[PDB]
Amino acid sequence: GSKPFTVPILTVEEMTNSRFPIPLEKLFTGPSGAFVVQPQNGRCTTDGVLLGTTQLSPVNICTFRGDVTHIAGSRNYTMNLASLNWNNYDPTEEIPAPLGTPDFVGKIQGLLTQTTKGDGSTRGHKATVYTGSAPFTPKLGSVQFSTDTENDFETHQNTKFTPVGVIQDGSTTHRNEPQQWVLPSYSGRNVHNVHLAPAVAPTFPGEQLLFFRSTMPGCSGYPNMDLDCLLPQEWVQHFYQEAAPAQSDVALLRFVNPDTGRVLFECKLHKSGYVTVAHTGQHDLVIPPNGYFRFDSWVNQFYTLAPM
Amino acid sequence: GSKPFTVPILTVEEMTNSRFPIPLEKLFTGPSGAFVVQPQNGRCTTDGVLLGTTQLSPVNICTFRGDVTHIAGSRNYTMNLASLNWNNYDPTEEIPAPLGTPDFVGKIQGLLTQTTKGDGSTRGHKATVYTGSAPFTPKLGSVQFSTDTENDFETHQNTKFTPVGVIQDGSTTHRNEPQQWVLPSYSGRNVHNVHLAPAVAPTFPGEQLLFFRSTMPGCSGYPNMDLDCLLPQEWVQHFYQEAAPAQSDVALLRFVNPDTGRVLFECKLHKSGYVTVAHTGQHDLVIPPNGYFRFDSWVNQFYTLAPM
C-alpha cells in the first residue's frame, strides 16, 4: 500500500542544476573516494524531505536578500540578510545557513539590485561575494559584497543579489577556484557548520557517483567552471510533491533511448537522494538528446549493476 | 479512457515566473479588455504543447547566446545568435524568435559573459538589451547590447547574456517602461511577427484573467517592475510531461486552504493555457502560504464561476 515512486521524464538537457541557476548539460562520473562530497543545495530524499540549505526554486539558488551598509574607504558593502521570503532572519533555525546560500567556496559574481520603497527608484551594480572569505557568515546573518560603487546604494532598502557566474585570480594557478566540493564556513572560520545534509559516497566496489553537470559562466580569470549536482532541481521539486515512500534503500533506474527502444545503462537512486553507476574513471557520458531515466524496481545497496 | 489531468501541488510562492527567471510572489487579477494580452513565454496547452517562444527551463527565460562583434566608437556589441543549445540558429523554424527570447518591450540589464575556448580565460560585463530598439532583431539572428566596455570582449567566442532586471529613463514619466504587454518586433520594426501564441481574453461576463505575478528587479531609474505570466513555469513543465488530454475546453480548479479545509475561490483553466476568475477590478489576491490549486472537473466556457 505504498504510493508508487517515479522520477520525471524530462531529459537531462531539459532540467536545471540544483546548485546554481543554470541548465544541466551532461552526466558525468568520476572517483570521489579521496575527498568528502557534501553539497547542501540539491539535497532531497526520494520521499520528498528537503535537506541542507535546499529550497524549491531554481532561481533562488545562490541568491541573497537583505539590506546593505557601505564599508568606508572601499567599494564593499555588508548585507544584513533577510530570510528567503524577506522576513527577519532567524539564526536558530535548524539549517546550515539561509536557504539557497551557496554551498561551495568560490567568488560568485552577479548584480546587486535595490529599490527605494518611497519613490520606486532603483539601482544595480556588479558585485562579487567571496564565499571563502572571513566576512562570509551567512548563518550569523551577514555577508560582504565587493561592488563597482562607493556611494550609490541606500541603507535600509531591500537589496537582492542575483548570481551569474564565477571568477578566478589570474595571477595564480589556472582553475584553482572555485572549489565546488569545499563547503563554506557558514558561521565564519572558527565555528563549525551545523545541520548539514550528510556526505555521500558509493559503497559498492566498482561504483562511482553519477553527477548532473553544468558549466558555470566565467566572469574573470581562469575559473574552474564545472558544477556537479546530485539531483536535478526538477527531481527535488518532483519528490517534494509526490512524497512517495521509499520501499527499500535503493531505486533501480534504467536510462532508456527511445530512438532504439534499448536501455543504455542502469543506475542506483539511493533513497537519501543521490545516484551511483558501475564505472571506474572519469567519464563524460554520451547520451541521446531524448534519453530519459525510468524507475523500474526497488532493490538495495547489495544489488550489482551492469557495468555502465 | 483519457489520462487524468492534474496541476502541481506547489504553492504560488514555491513556483517560478514563466516570463522572467524570478519567483512568483502573488496572484493578481485586473481588466484587460482594452489591450491585447499575447505573451509568448509561459505558453503551453493543458495537454502539453508548448507555444510561442516557450521552452522548458526557468533559467533560460530572457537569455541570449552567441558570439559578439564590437561597434566602433561605442560600448555596444552586436550578438549573432546561436540556438538555445548553442548550435547554428535557423531563422526559418516556425517560432516567433529563438526560444526564451524576451516577450516584452523593455530595457533588460544583466551580465554578458564569455569564455575563450583555447585557454579558458573569461570575462564578464554589465550589459543591457533594449527589446524595443531598431537593432532588436532576434528572429533574424541578431540583437545589440550596450555594455560597460569598448574592447574587452573577443570575437568568435561563446558569449551568454544572463538577465537580472530592468531599467527606465528617469528623465521621463516614472514607470512608463517596461511595457510588459507590448511584444517586441522580433524581425525589426518593418516586419510583422509570425507563429505567435494567440492573444487571450475572458469571454464570460464578469470574468478577468488571473495572473501569476512577480516583481522584476530594477537596475536604474523608475521602472514598472510588475510581471504577469499566464502559467507558472512549473505548470508548463508539468503539462509537457503529463500530456493529459483535455476532455473539454475548461478545467475547473478550486484553490484550497489546508489550514481550514475550505475552498477560497474557483477558477477556469482554459485548455489553451490561461486562467480566468469571476471578479471586476484590479485586485491583489490575499492567499494563505499553504494554499494550492486542485483540479476538480472538466466544464466548458459556459460555466458560471462563483464570484472570487
Side-chain angles (χ1 to χ4, degrees), chain A residues 1-149 152-300 302-308, chain B residues 1-149 152-300 302-308:
Chain A
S2 302
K3 179 180 195 175
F5 177 70
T6 62
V7 301
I9 65 169
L10 299 172
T11 67
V12 169
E13 297 200 86
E14 290 172 343
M15 291 190 289
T16 310
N17 205 291
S18 57
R19 295 179 65 218
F20 202 82
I22 53 184
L24 293 182
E25 295 160 23
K26 68 163 71 104
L27 301 174
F28 174 81
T29 186
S32 63
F35 55 96
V36 181
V37 173
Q38 194 166 12
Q40 299 300 305
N41 289 315
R43 300 300 300 269
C44 185
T45 66
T46 57
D47 69 349
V49 181
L50 309 177
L51 310 171
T53 56
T54 296
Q55 51 74 59
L56 290 159
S57 165
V59 297
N60 282 336
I61 304 163
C62 290
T63 68
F64 288 107
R65 295 161 171 74
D67 40 70
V68 293
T69 303
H70 182 235
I71 297 170
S74 78
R75 293 177 166 194
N76 299 319
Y77 285 78
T78 298
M79 185 183 278
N80 293 111
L81 300 181
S83 73
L84 191 68
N85 298 283
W86 295 95
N87 309 314
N88 302 125
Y89 169 66
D90 180 1
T92 71
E93 287 278 347
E94 299 195 323
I95 58 182
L99 299 180
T101 295
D103 70 353
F104 61 94
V105 168
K107 298 168 183 161
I108 301 171
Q109 187 165 103
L111 288 189
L112 267 182
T113 58
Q114 181 181 86
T115 298
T116 299
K117 182 183 188 59
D119 64 358
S121 59
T122 68
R123 55 208 63 84
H125 295 277
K126 196 168 70 178
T128 307
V129 57
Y130 296 22
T131 68
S133 68
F136 192 74
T137 56
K139 176 61 172 179
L140 307 185
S142 72
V143 304
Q144 188 178 116
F145 292 92
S146 294
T147 81
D148 57 30
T149 187
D152 191 37
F153 286 111
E154 303 180 358
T155 56
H156 304 301
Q157 299 292 344
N158 281 341
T159 309
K160 183 193 166 207
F161 179 70
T162 300
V164 174
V166 293
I167 66 170
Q168 179 269 359
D169 181 342
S171 79
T172 69
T173 300
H174 296 181
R175 298 167 274 284
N176 61 355
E177 58 171 327
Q179 298 155 34
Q180 70 162 321
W181 301 122
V182 179
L183 290 173
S185 295
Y186 298 118
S187 294
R189 290 172 174 168
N190 289 314
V191 180
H192 282 82
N193 291 335
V194 295
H195 300 302
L196 295 175
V200 303
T203 56
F204 194 105
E207 286 186 17
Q208 288 178 171
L209 292 168
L210 184 66
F211 299 101
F212 298 87
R213 174 168 280 201
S214 304
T215 308
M216 293 178 291
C219 304
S220 197
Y222 303 82
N224 184 344
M225 290 168 281
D226 294 329
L227 186 74
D228 292 306
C229 69
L230 301 180
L231 299 172
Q233 187 65 22
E234 287 80 4
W235 289 25
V236 173
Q237 294 187 336
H238 186 80
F239 302 154
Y240 175 77
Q241 293 180 81
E242 289 291 304
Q247 297 183 223
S248 76
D249 289 338
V250 178
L252 184 63
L253 314 181
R254 271 57 181 275
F255 189 92
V256 175
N257 181 5
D259 285 4
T260 63
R262 294 190 296 280
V263 176
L264 183 54
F265 66 90
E266 61 180 15
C267 64
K268 288 173 172 167
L269 171 58
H270 300 264
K271 74 170 182 187
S272 59
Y274 63 96
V275 183
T276 61
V277 283
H279 188 74
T280 299
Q282 297 187 327
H283 184 74
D284 282 347
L285 282 72
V286 180
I287 61 180
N290 303 318
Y292 66 97
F293 291 90
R294 181 188 71 202
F295 171 63
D296 284 350
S297 65
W298 287 105
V299 298
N300 89 337
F302 310 154
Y303 185 87
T304 302
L305 294 168
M308 190 191 78
Chain B
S2 302
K3 179 180 195 175
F5 177 70
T6 62
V7 301
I9 65 169
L10 299 172
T11 67
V12 169
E13 297 200 86
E14 290 172 343
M15 291 190 289
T16 310
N17 205 291
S18 57
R19 295 179 65 218
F20 202 82
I22 53 184
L24 293 182
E25 295 160 23
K26 68 163 71 104
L27 301 174
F28 174 81
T29 186
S32 63
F35 55 96
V36 181
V37 173
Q38 194 166 12
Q40 299 300 305
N41 289 315
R43 300 300 300 269
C44 185
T45 66
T46 57
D47 69 349
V49 181
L50 309 177
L51 310 171
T53 56
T54 296
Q55 51 74 59
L56 290 159
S57 165
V59 297
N60 282 336
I61 304 163
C62 290
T63 68
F64 288 107
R65 295 161 171 74
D67 40 70
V68 293
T69 303
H70 182 235
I71 297 170
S74 78
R75 293 177 166 194
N76 299 319
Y77 285 78
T78 298
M79 185 183 278
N80 293 111
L81 300 181
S83 73
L84 191 68
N85 298 283
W86 295 95
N87 309 314
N88 302 125
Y89 169 66
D90 180 1
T92 71
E93 287 278 347
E94 299 195 323
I95 58 182
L99 299 180
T101 295
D103 70 353
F104 61 94
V105 168
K107 298 168 183 161
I108 301 171
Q109 187 165 103
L111 288 189
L112 267 182
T113 58
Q114 181 181 86
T115 298
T116 299
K117 182 183 188 59
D119 64 358
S121 59
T122 68
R123 55 208 63 84
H125 295 277
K126 196 168 70 178
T128 307
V129 57
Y130 296 22
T131 68
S133 68
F136 192 74
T137 56
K139 176 61 172 179
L140 307 185
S142 72
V143 304
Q144 188 178 116
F145 292 92
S146 294
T147 81
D148 57 30
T149 187
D152 191 37
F153 286 111
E154 303 180 358
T155 56
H156 304 301
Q157 299 292 344
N158 281 341
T159 309
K160 183 193 166 207
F161 179 70
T162 300
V164 174
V166 293
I167 66 170
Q168 179 269 359
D169 181 342
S171 79
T172 69
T173 300
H174 296 181
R175 298 167 274 284
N176 61 355
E177 58 171 327
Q179 298 155 34
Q180 70 162 321
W181 301 122
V182 179
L183 290 173
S185 295
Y186 298 118
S187 294
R189 290 172 174 168
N190 289 314
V191 180
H192 282 82
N193 291 335
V194 295
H195 300 302
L196 295 175
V200 303
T203 56
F204 194 105
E207 286 186 17
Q208 288 178 171
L209 292 168
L210 184 66
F211 299 101
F212 298 87
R213 174 168 280 201
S214 304
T215 308
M216 293 178 291
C219 304
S220 197
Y222 303 82
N224 184 344
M225 290 168 281
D226 294 329
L227 186 74
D228 292 306
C229 69
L230 301 180
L231 299 172
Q233 187 65 22
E234 287 80 4
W235 289 25
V236 173
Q237 294 187 336
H238 186 80
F239 302 154
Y240 175 77
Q241 293 180 81
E242 289 291 304
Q247 297 183 223
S248 76
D249 289 338
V250 178
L252 184 63
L253 314 181
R254 271 57 181 275
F255 189 92
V256 175
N257 181 5
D259 285 4
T260 63
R262 294 190 296 280
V263 176
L264 183 54
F265 66 90
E266 61 180 15
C267 64
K268 288 173 172 167
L269 171 58
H270 300 264
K271 74 170 182 187
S272 59
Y274 63 96
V275 183
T276 61
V277 283
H279 188 74
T280 299
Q282 297 187 327
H283 184 74
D284 282 347
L285 282 72
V286 180
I287 61 180
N290 303 318
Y292 66 97
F293 291 90
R294 181 188 71 202
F295 171 63
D296 284 350
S297 65
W298 287 105
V299 298
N300 89 337
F302 310 154
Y303 185 87
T304 302
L305 294 168
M308 190 191 78

